[PDB]
């Protein structure tokens, strides 16, 4: 239940959805990417009814990360129509990912 994002189609699916989207900016090479990877599955499936789970990996679409003036990975950012609401830097657990979430959405 996750969308993955490009340079090409983010625009189209992120900044035109009218919904809430959450963005996974992650890398390969970054291990605490990997290590919430199983989290954000959960949490697509969770919160599918609510939001919209998306991930774009840095190495193969550079130019969103670039736009958006992303330091680190993993960053979170929640959009709401086409500008974003809030963002979380670095690895998370479930139960955090939940609060962020429940914190503006319920």
Do not use: H, M
């Not at 959960?42 to 789970?53: G, N, R």
């Not at 840095?58 to 086409?82: A, C, E, H, M, W």
């Amino acid at each position: 239940k996750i969308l993955q994002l490009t340079d090409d189609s983010f625009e189209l699916n992120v900044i035109s959805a009218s919904g809430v989207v959450l963005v996974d900016f992650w890398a390969e090479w970054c291990s605490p990417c990997k290590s919430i990877s199983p989290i954000i599955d959960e949490i697509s499936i969770e919160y599918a009814d609510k939001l919209t789970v998306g991930k774009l990996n840095i190495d193969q679409n550079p130019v969103v990360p670039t736009k958006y003036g992303i330091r680190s990975i993993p960053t979170l950012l929640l959009f709401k129509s086409g500008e974003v609401i809030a963002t979380k830097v670095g690895a998370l657990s479930k139960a955090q990912l939940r609060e962020f979430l429940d914190a503006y959405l319920k």
